[PDB]
Design an enzyme around this catalytic site. Structure first.
Site, PDB file in Angstrom:
ATOM      1  N   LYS A  12       4.996  -3.185   8.158  1.00 60.76           N
ATOM      2  CA  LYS A  12       6.170  -2.555   7.591  1.00 60.76           C
ATOM      3  C   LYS A  12       7.310  -3.560   7.608  1.00 60.76           C
ATOM      4  O   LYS A  12       7.634  -4.139   8.649  1.00 60.76           O
ATOM      5  CB  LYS A  12       6.539  -1.330   8.404  1.00 60.76           C
ATOM      6  CG  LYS A  12       7.711  -0.553   7.841  1.00 60.76           C
ATOM      7  CD  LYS A  12       7.988   0.627   8.786  1.00 60.76           C
ATOM      8  CE  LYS A  12       9.083   1.492   8.294  1.00 60.76           C
ATOM      9  NZ  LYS A  12       9.172   2.660   9.214  1.00 60.76           N
TER      10      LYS A  12
ATOM     11  N   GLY B  21      11.171   1.474   4.573  1.00 56.03           N
ATOM     12  CA  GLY B  21      10.544   0.171   4.501  1.00 56.03           C
ATOM     13  C   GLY B  21       9.251   0.218   3.735  1.00 56.03           C
ATOM     14  O   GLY B  21       8.523   1.217   3.771  1.00 56.03           O
ATOM     15  N   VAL B  22       8.958  -0.857   3.042  1.00 58.74           N
ATOM     16  CA  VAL B  22       7.708  -0.990   2.307  1.00 58.74           C
ATOM     17  C   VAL B  22       6.617  -1.311   3.312  1.00 58.74           C
ATOM     18  O   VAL B  22       6.843  -2.050   4.281  1.00 58.74           O
ATOM     19  CB  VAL B  22       7.832  -2.088   1.241  1.00 58.74           C
ATOM     20  CG1 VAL B  22       6.533  -2.256   0.504  1.00 58.74           C
ATOM     21  CG2 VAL B  22       8.959  -1.746   0.263  1.00 58.74           C
ATOM     22  N   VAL B  23       5.426  -0.768   3.088  1.00 56.15           N
ATOM     23  CA  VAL B  23       4.277  -1.004   3.950  1.00 56.15           C
ATOM     24  C   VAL B  23       3.227  -1.782   3.177  1.00 56.15           C
ATOM     25  O   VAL B  23       2.867  -1.412   2.043  1.00 56.15           O
ATOM     26  CB  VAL B  23       3.703   0.319   4.473  1.00 56.15           C
ATOM     27  CG1 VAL B  23       2.422   0.068   5.251  1.00 56.15           C
ATOM     28  CG2 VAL B  23       4.751   1.035   5.325  1.00 56.15           C
TER      29      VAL B  23
ATOM     30  N   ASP C  75      12.036  13.071  11.943  1.00 56.46           N
ATOM     31  CA  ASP C  75      11.459  13.001  10.592  1.00 56.46           C
ATOM     32  C   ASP C  75      10.012  13.456  10.643  1.00 56.46           C
ATOM     33  O   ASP C  75       9.131  12.850  10.022  1.00 56.46           O
ATOM     34  CB  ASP C  75      11.671  11.608   9.956  1.00 56.46           C
ATOM     35  CG  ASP C  75      11.314  11.561   8.473  1.00 56.46           C
ATOM     36  OD1 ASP C  75      10.885  10.479   7.994  1.00 56.46           O
ATOM     37  OD2 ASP C  75      11.499  12.587   7.789  1.00 56.46           O
TER      38      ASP C  75
ATOM     39  N   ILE D 157       0.803  -1.221   0.000  1.00 56.16           N
ATOM     40  CA  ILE D 157       0.000   0.000   0.000  1.00 56.16           C
ATOM     41  C   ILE D 157       0.834   1.268   0.000  1.00 56.16           C
ATOM     42  O   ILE D 157       0.282   2.350  -0.237  1.00 56.16           O
ATOM     43  CB  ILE D 157      -1.042   0.025   1.141  1.00 56.16           C
ATOM     44  CG1 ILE D 157      -0.365  -0.033   2.512  1.00 56.16           C
ATOM     45  CG2 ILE D 157      -2.024  -1.145   1.000  1.00 56.16           C
ATOM     46  CD1 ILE D 157      -1.349   0.143   3.669  1.00 56.16           C
ATOM     47  N   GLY D 158       2.127   1.195   0.270  1.00 52.13           N
ATOM     48  CA  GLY D 158       2.910   2.408   0.322  1.00 52.13           C
ATOM     49  C   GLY D 158       4.266   2.135   0.933  1.00 52.13           C
ATOM     50  O   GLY D 158       4.772   1.001   0.902  1.00 52.13           O
ATOM     51  N   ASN D 159       4.861   3.199   1.458  1.00 54.68           N
ATOM     52  CA  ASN D 159       6.202   3.081   2.018  1.00 54.68           C
ATOM     53  C   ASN D 159       6.361   4.076   3.154  1.00 54.68           C
ATOM     54  O   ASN D 159       5.784   5.175   3.137  1.00 54.68           O
ATOM     55  CB  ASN D 159       7.289   3.404   0.970  1.00 54.68           C
ATOM     56  CG  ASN D 159       7.204   2.541  -0.281  1.00 54.68           C
ATOM     57  OD1 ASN D 159       7.802   1.469  -0.351  1.00 54.68           O
ATOM     58  ND2 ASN D 159       6.495   3.030  -1.294  1.00 54.68           N
ATOM     59  N   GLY D 160       7.160   3.679   4.146  1.00 54.69           N
ATOM     60  CA  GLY D 160       7.774   4.615   5.061  1.00 54.69           C
ATOM     61  C   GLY D 160       9.065   5.102   4.450  1.00 54.69           C
ATOM     62  O   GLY D 160       9.345   4.882   3.269  1.00 54.69           O
TER      63      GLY D 160
END
Ligand SMILES: [Cl-]
Lengths: 13, 347
Positions: free
Chosen positions: B51, B34-36, B147, B28-31
């Site tokens: 994650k 890391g991939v989420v 961050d 669904i996305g990324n931090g």
């Protein structure tokens, strides 16, 4: 839209 | 699409691993690092985020160490973690099973901005207040996030609950231990970092929070730019150049400015911007790091008075999310503020 987003999809797109 | 059963360790408390089954995994996305994925827990049907980060064969994972310590209603909860292996060799993943939140402050802000519409100030108040609570909480452990940006502020827009996420840049800051800022604090970079400070403090997160507030008020970033050099030009347009004293407070090792006066804060934002929002922003976006409000002081600012009204409701008619369930840990920097932060009707 454009820019850096956390998720690929959004209801706010 | 198949059911995956792992033995996962609950985030909180001593290690008591449990069998956990999940399914319907999809990226669904990324931090930042890391991939989420989303997944559904087979037990309850609840959606979670997973994650996936690379596990170092020789070094501990700092993000895991930090997240196992945290329990706050405005920080994404680490439900479980587990390890998994690819086919490579030494290819191990740490999997952080997190509460799933569908949207972010950035998505909502960008929607309003691209529509040329002002984000209602009640939402600015709610989002910023919850961010400041999350910072008060992590800072009480000495943990600086490093961050803070709107893409890391998860949001359920209907309940208005905000959760801070992505602790991949975070670190406990200890007086006397030098720190670096190469891969962190790139989004809203505090000026002491642009000036090369290695003795910086958790007030870098308060600078970032000030940039979030200004962006929600303006509909665009206040200090745009890829590099610190670019952001500094934009910072000077508002704050003027730092004085010699402010430079010493930011980085006393900075040897190598024209005097350029600050631009009045009332002229930075649109007319009709609430004066208390401008006042709050002026006490966050300060060169001198020790002059910035602490997170708990920011929560107590007059800008948030509407949230303390006994009759406050969300625009959709629902009750506000939790605002007054403070803990000792969270209040520890200044417990007397509790009298103001929690009105009598809320305790
Ligand atoms: Cl986003």
């Amino acid at each position: 839209x454009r820019g850096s987003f956390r998720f690929f999809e959004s209801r706010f797109c | 699409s198949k059911v995956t059963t792992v033995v996962a360790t609950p985030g909180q408390g001593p290690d008591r691993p449990q069998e956990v089954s999940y399914t319907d995994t999809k990226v669904i996305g990324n931090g930042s690092f890391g991939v989420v994925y989303q997944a559904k827990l087979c037990d309850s049907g609840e959606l979670v985020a997973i994650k996936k980060v690379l596990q170092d064969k020789r070094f501990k994972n700092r993000e895991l160490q930090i997240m196992r310590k945290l329990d706050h209603c405005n920080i994404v909860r680490l439900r479980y973690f587990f390890y998994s292996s690819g086919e490579k060799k030494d290819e191990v993943y740490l999997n952080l099973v997190l509460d799933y939140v569908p949207e972010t402050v950035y998505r909502v802000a960008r929607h309003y901005s691209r529509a040329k519409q002002t984000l209602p100030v009640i939402y600015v108040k709610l989002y910023m207040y919850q961010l400041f609570r999350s910072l008060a909480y992590i800072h009480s452990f000495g943990i600086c996030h490093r961050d803070i940006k709107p893409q890391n502020l998860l949001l359920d827009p209907d309940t208005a609950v905000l959760k801070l996420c992505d602790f991949g840049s975070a670190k406990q800051l200890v007086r006397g231990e030098p720190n670096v800022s190469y891969i962190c604090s790139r989004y809203y970079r505090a000026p002491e970092l642009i000036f090369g400070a290695t003795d910086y403090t958790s007030s870098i997160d308060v600078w970032s929070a000030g940039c979030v507030l200004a962006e929600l008020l303006l509909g665009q970033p206040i200090f745009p730019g890829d590099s610190g050099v670019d952001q500094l030009v934009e910072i000077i347009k508002v704050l003027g150049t730092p004085t010699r004293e402010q430079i010493r407070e930011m980085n006393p090792n900075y040897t190598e400015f024209p005097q350029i006066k600050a631009h009045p804060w009332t002229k930075v934002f649109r007319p009709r911007t609430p004066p208390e929002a401008i006042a709050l922003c002026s006490r966050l976006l300060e060169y001198t790091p020790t002059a910035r409000l602490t997170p708990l002081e920011a929560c107590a600012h007059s800008f948030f008075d509407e949230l303390r009204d006994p009759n406050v409701k969300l625009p959709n008619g629902r009750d506000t999310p939790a605002l007054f369930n403070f803990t000792t840990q969270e209040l520890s920097s200044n417990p007397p503020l509790a009298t103001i932060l929690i009105p009598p009707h809320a305790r």
